[PDB]
Each structure stands twice: as C-alpha cells, then as structure tokens.
Amino acid sequence: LTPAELIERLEQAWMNEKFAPELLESKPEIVECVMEQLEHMEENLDLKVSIHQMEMERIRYVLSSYLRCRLMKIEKFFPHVLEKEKTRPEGEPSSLSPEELAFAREFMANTESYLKNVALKHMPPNLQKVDLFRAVPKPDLDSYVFLRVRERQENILVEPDTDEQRDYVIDLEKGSQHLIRYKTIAPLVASGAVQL
C-alpha cells in the first residue's frame, strides 16, 4: 500500500512479463498508482531536486519497459489475445487493460484488412479466407524458465516429458532459485508465490 511497495510490485511485473512465454494478467491498479506518483512528484518540482528526478527516471523506465513488453506480446499473439478475452469467464482477471484491448482490436482489423485487399480477395473463391487463430502461433508454455521462490510451496510435480514414470515431486523453498518448465509453475507466477 506504500509507495516503496508500489515500486516493488511494478518491478515484479516487469521481470515476470519479460520472461513469461505468455501474456500475463493486466495490472491496472499498479500502472495507475505509478503514473500518479510520477505526476505528483513532477509537480512538487535543489540537489534534492536532482535526486528526485533521477529516481523518477528509474521508475519511468521500468513502467515504459513493462508496457513495451506487453505490447509486443499482444502483437505477437493478437488473435489469441482477442479470442481469450472474448471467452473469458466473468470474474477471472483479464490479460488486457481497456486500452490494450483497443490496441489489440485495431491491430487485428488493420492486418486482416491489409491481408484481404492485397492478396486474399485476389485468390480463388475457395481460398480467400485464412483462419488467423490457426495461422498465428500460440504461446509455447513448454518453455524453460528461471525463478526465485518468494513463498514456500510444496508438492510441486516435475514432469520431465510425457512418460509419467519419470514424474517426481519437489518442494520450492523460500529464497531458492530453480530452472524448470514454465507450464509447471505458471499458477505460481500469477499468485506471486514465485518470481521469474
């Protein structure tokens, strides 16, 4: 609830977003509070001044980087981002802020239109519709990642491959660092029990 904690939360999202193979949950409450803090401090604006402006730059940088990272993911999986939001059950956290959603919609329309007018409409009658949900790659959740355990977790199943015989249980201790498949610890990233 404190500013210091606000910043820690941001850096956490920044780092997690950088390494997760899929688009993570939208953190509107964090982005806003950070924008407010910057606005307030910006207005309050001698050596103390230069020190404050230096810190403001450090924070501005993390926000921008985090937001930049989210846009590239939205662009990369745009059809899957839109389809997931469309069938998202009421209550579950969205992977898109109202603004990012607009950006994603526009990306889709623009690309689909470009593709239609430039080639598809000029193709035979039975080959003019291209399924974008199929043409564009989905996130690969079977990607390996490194993490730092923030909160102790037990009975975590490690699945080497598709052969159940190689499966074994593991426990993640607070402060430890691990290497493992993302899909196995995805829920832990979301809950904040672990950090990528």
Binding site: E57, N110, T111, L127
Partner: protein, 145 residues
C-alpha cells in the same frame, strides 16, 4: 515447377538480414496469384470429368493441384506478414516519419498499415498518462547518468 515463383518471394526476404526491407515484389505476387487462378481453373475442369465424363483417375492430379494452391497461398501470406513485422519494427527504430529508402520499397498498402499502426500506438500511449502522458517510445534504455 509449381510453387517455384512463390519460393522466390521467400528466399528474397530470407536473404535480407537485420530485418532490412527489399522492394515489394509486385511482379512476383502477380505471377503467384495467376498461377493459383490457373491451377484452380485446371482443377475445376478435371473435377468435372471426374464427376461425369472422365474417371476417378484424375483425383491424384486434383489433389496435387490443390496442395499446390494451399502452398502458394501459404507462401504469399507468409511473405506479406513478414514484411509487416519488419515494418512494424521501423516505428520503434526510426520513429513516426520514415526515410525515403524505406518508404520507396514499401507498397502503398504497407504504408497505410504503418500509419494505421502508428495512429493506434499514439492513441494507446496518450491514454496512459493524464490527457497526454507517457511516450513509451522514449527511455528505450535504462537511465545512466
């Protein structure tokens, strides 16, 4: 034989490093769209005979033509999509105004895609902070004074 023209579009982009943008291949795109038309017409004819007037001995040839159609379609779409990705990159590397070298190798339609894109990014970035706040096109690198 078939789909060779389509492969020329792929090799052309593939040999363009760093995401460089060679001239839009209008001729190549036209020749491919034509082959598709021809392939589709030839196939639409043999299918008739197969149905009544010929034999189910054309089916193998019909499948061959079909695959060749799907293949040409895969190549062109892939070709066009890759160009858009390289063009999307331009906004983040050069800014909102592109140099002559890039715009002269871009198709009018690609320029429009770029503009639609930068207009959407401007709107996104502007909704971020107050009335007009946070150009996330700046601060591309960690601050170091």
């Amino acid at each position: 034989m078939f789909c060779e023209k389509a492969m020329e579009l792929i090799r052309e982009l593939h040999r363009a490093p760093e995401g460089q943008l060679p001239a839009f291949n209008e001729d190549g795109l036209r020749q491919v769209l034509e082959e598709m038309k021809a392939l589709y017409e030839q196939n639409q004819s043999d299918v008739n005979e197969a149905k009544s007037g010929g034999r189910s001995d054309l089916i193998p040839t019909i499948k061959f033509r079909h695959c060749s159609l799907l293949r040409n379609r895969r190549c062109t779409v892939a070709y066009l999509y890759d160009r858009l990705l390289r063009i999307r990159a331009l906004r983040w590397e050069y800014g909102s105004i592109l140099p002559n070298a890039l715009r002269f190798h871009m198709a009018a339609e690609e320029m429009e895609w770029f503009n639609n894109y930068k207009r959407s990014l401007a709107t996104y970035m502007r909704s971020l902070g107050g009335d007009e706040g946070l150009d996330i096109t700046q601060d591309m690198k960690p601050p170091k004074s």
